Amino acid sequence: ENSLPKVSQSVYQMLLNEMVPLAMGIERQRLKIEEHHTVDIIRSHNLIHELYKADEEEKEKVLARLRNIGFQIGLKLSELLIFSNNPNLKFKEMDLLLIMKFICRDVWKQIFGKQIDNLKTNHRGTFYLLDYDYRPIQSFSLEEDAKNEELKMIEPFLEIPVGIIRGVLSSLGYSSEEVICLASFIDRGVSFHVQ
Amino acid sequence: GIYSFWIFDRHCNCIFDREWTLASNSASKQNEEDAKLLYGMIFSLRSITQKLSKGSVKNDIRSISTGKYRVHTYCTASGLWFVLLSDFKQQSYTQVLQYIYSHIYVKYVSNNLLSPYDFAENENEMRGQGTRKITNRNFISVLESFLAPMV
Amino acid sequence: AFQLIKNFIESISIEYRKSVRLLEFKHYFITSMLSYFEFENVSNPLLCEIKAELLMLKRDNWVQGVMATSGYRLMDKNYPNSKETFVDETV
Amino acid sequence: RSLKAMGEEIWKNKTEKINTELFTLTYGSIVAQLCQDYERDFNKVNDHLYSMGYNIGCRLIEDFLARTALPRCENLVKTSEVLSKCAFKIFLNITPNITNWSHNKDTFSLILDENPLADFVELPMDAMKSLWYSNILCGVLKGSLEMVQLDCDVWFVSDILRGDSQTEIKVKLNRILKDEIPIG
Amino acid sequence: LRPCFVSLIDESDKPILIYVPNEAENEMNDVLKYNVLSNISLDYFESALVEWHSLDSKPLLKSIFQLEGVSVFAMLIKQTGLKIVIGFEQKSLSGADDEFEAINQIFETVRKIYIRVKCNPLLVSGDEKSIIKSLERKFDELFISTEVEL
Numbered sequence: 004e005n006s007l008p009k010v011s012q013s014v015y016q017m018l019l020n021e022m023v024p025l026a027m028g029i030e031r032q033r034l035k036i037e038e039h040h041t042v043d044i045i046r047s048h049n050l051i052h053e054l055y056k057a058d059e060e061e062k063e064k065v066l067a068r069l070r071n072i073g074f075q076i077g078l079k080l081s082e083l084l085i086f087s088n089n090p091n092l093k094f095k096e097m098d099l100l101l102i103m104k105f106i107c108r109d110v111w112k113q114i115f116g117k118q119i120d121n122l123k124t125n126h127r128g129t130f131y132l133l134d135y136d137y138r139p140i141q142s143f144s145l146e147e148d149a150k151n152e153e154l155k156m157i158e159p160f161l162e163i164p165v166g167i168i169r170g171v172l173s174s175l176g177y178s179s180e181e182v183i184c185l186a187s188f189i190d191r192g193v194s195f196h197v198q
Numbered sequence: 199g200i201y202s203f204w205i206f207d208r209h210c211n212c213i214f215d216r217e218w219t220l221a222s223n224s225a226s227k228q229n230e231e232d233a234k235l236l237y238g239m240i241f242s243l244r245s246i247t248q249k250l251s252k253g254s255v256k257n258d259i260r261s262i263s264t265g266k267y268r269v270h271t272y273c274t275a276s277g278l279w280f281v282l283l284s285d286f287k288q289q290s291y292t293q294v295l296q297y298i299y300s301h302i303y304v305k306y307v308s309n310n311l312l313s314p315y316d317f318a319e320n321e322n323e324m325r326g327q328g329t330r331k332i333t334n335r336n337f338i339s340v341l342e343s344f345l346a347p348m349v
Numbered sequence: 350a351f352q353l354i355k356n357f358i359e360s361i362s363i364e365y366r367k368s369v370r371l372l373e374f375k376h377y378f379i380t381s382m383l384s385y386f387e388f389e390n391v392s393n394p395l396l397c398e399i400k401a402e403l404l405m406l407k408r409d410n411w412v413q414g415v416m417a418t419s420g421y422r423l424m425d426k427n428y429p430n431s432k433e434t435f436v437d438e439t440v
Numbered sequence: 441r442s443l444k445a446m447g448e449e450i451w452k453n454k455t456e457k458i459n460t461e462l463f464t465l466t467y468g469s470i471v472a473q474l475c476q477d478y479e480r481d482f483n484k485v486n487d488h489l490y491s492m493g494y495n496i497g498c499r500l501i502e503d504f505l506a507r508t509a510l511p512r513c514e515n516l517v518k519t520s521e522v523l524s525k526c527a528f529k530i531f532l533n534i535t536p537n538i539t540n541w542s543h544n545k546d547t548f549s550l551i552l553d554e555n556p557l558a559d560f561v562e563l564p565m566d567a568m569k570s571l572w573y574s575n576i577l578c579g580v581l582k583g584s585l586e587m588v589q590l591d592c593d594v595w596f597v598s599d600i601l602r603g604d605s606q607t608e609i610k611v612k613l614n615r616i617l618k619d620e621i622p623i624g
Numbered sequence: 625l626r627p628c629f630v631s632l633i634d635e636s637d638k639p640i641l642i643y644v645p646n647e648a649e650n651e652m653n654d655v656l657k658y659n660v661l662s663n664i665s666l667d668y669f670e671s672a673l674v675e676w677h678s679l680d681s682k683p684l685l686k687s688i689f690q691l692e693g694v695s696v697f698a699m700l701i702k703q704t705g706l707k708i709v710i711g712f713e714q715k716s717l718s719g720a721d722d723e724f725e726a727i728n729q730i731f732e733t734v735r736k737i738y739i740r741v742k743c744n745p746l747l748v749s750g751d752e753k754s755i756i757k758s759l760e761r762k763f764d765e766l767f768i769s770t771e772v773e774l
């Protein structure tokens with residue numbers, strides 16, 4: 004239908020990469036940059052992500068700050084989805100844990116583009132969604148000596164869509180939990196699991 | 199025929215690894231000295247065409263066309279110099295080098311946040327005698343995927 | 350031969366429910382107790398007849414605990430939702 | 441004018457669309473994360489929002505040159521206008537205008553018409569002083585420009601909320617030193 | 625097409641997990657029958673001269689049994705001493721050979737799931753608690769929860 008406002012996916016996507024060394028720099032707080040007013044020391048983004056899992060600090064307090072930031076995103080976009088477009092499926096108050104399949108059929112296409120899911124739910128008690136090529140970190144690289152050492156590193160990046168889909172259920176009002184695995188498809192991987 | 203690919207930054211460093219895509223001459227490091235003398239041939243000839251400039255613009259170097267081979271360069275405006283040594287069968291790769299900048303480089307180097315800008319080792323020997331940086335599982339493989347059609 | 354008895358039990362168990370044909374399947378197994386009634390001897394090959402009679406006793410216990418909600422014995426409820434007359438009382 | 445039309449051609453070349461209001465909430469959310477995490481120190485979030493901007497702009501500028509095959513500018517006067525239209529317009533669908541163009545050609549300012557960091561934003565009276573909202577824009581401009589070998593400093597001086605006046609960034613050129621000692 | 629339990633025993637005759645699907649949300653206390661069926665098959669490893677194994681190349685689907693409402697068997701790979709067994713409810717049983725090789729191949733799928741979760745070093749020293757919950761969390765979608773995929 005209506006298609007008025009547009010901004011790039013790219014600068015968006017690097018911002019979605021860049022909430023995590025932001026949070027590491029929050030916890031850890033010379034290139035004298037703003038020398039009209041002040042000075043900075045440095046900010047090693049290549050070593051900030053090589054300080055959480057490549058040095059094994061107390062990131063467990065910091066992981067809540069990755070969890071926290073998606074909630075206020077996840078609370079306040081359901082109303083913004085009907086200002087995104089108005090496709091008449093947009094109403095919210097008919098279903099409880101059975102339009103989370105379909106609110107993550109759209110906002111997961113509107114912050115991640117694709118819709119390859121293969122959803123599975125045990126007796127409509129717990130619903131889980133998984134995809135084979137996650138849009139941030141399947142553009143990401145390695146140090147080529149192994150691969151399993153690199154899957155230590157990427158574990159804080161998975162926690163940003165914790166807060167999103169937990170935000171929408173708390174937008175409907177909930178206290179049901181959520182945990183993230185990392186799958187491995189066999190054809191040319193990460194899974195999600197909510198109660 | 200393509201002999202060798204190399205990657206040249208602003209700080210006069212090559213970041214090309216073990217020689218292949220027919221840089222081993224068997225798919226039709228010892229050349230760390232060869233990185234310097236390739237740089238001296240280009241940078242001196244960078245200054246020649248800089249000193250002859252017409253019409254309120256600078257001048258990029260397309261190709262030194264030597265005897266018994268060629269060399270094709272692509273100096274960026276960021277000081278990145280993608281250099282490729284052909285065998286004079288095809289003409290200048292001034293869009294193949296744009297494909298390996300806009301697609302295989304910037305989407306696989308400098309978007310990956312576990313690898314830096316490859317600038318310096320937190321130290322002031324960027325201008326020489328530094329061990330290289332580019333070792334990726336994906337990037338080296340997808341480069342070799344792209345250039346095995348050529349050789 | 351026990352696998353042949355199992356395939357015969359599946360042939361009877363294609364339709365056997367609520368003593369309409371569950372009684373027929375239990376009756377066919379009680380006449381298919383000729384595994385116990387063909388060979389039964391001492392200094393045999395180590396109580397395979399006793400294992401077969403144990404499985405047949407499980408079948409007869411399932412027959413008595415099926416066919417009319419009466420008693421069980423094991424608190425089993427092995428009969429799910431679906432006439433030799435050896436047990437005429439719950440005690 | 442070709443560099444007029446480059447932004448519209450790239451806006452038909454690239455196909456990447458987010459709705460603009462979704463970008464604003466993901467910027468208001470992260471500055472709210474800084475606001476509630478740190479101790480309401482609006483001074484002390486401009487610096488680290490700038491640190492965000494620096495360390496994301498110096499990876500931003502090479503994909504900007506990837507889409508826009510442009511030569512390295514050497515004066516102020518052409519990079520000011522191409523930063524005022526193309527390098528924003530392929531990313532942020534805006535065209536900020538250069539005004540107050542100084543006679544010594546070392547400084548300028550930049551009115552921007554609208555911004556998608558500050559579309560529908562209200563700040564509290566605690567936040568109403570001692571804070572500049574788009575210090576990530578200061579970060580991305582300064583960390584963008586120190587890749588291309590000019591150590592300009594920009595600093596954003598007036599919100600459309602702070603003072604409710606106008607949106608300006610004071611800019612100052614500095615030296616144009618290129619790299620050296622290839623002998624080592 | 626649906627197992628009635630999943631049982632796992634290592635080489636020391638210690639049961640790793642006697643997993644039963646749907647003991648919450650549905651009928652309880654038949655799990656007390658299920659684990660003692662597993663123990664009947666555990667001391668019924670080899671008894672009264674009945675041999676299950678004759679092929680040493682790949683350990684295929686071995687001898688079917690049937691006891692008091694279920695249909696159990698065994699699949700001893702003989703590789704790292706794994707002794708895992710699966711029963712099926714006899715009440716929904718068609719008794720064909722593509723059924724027989726079908727439960728052979730899904731026995732190899734649950735073998736694959738155990739050998740995948742056996743060497744996941746994303747969490748190390750996962751040997752006593754929530755390794756069990758994690759493998760149950762990988763069990764409970766391969767035979768069920770297909771209801772919403774379409």
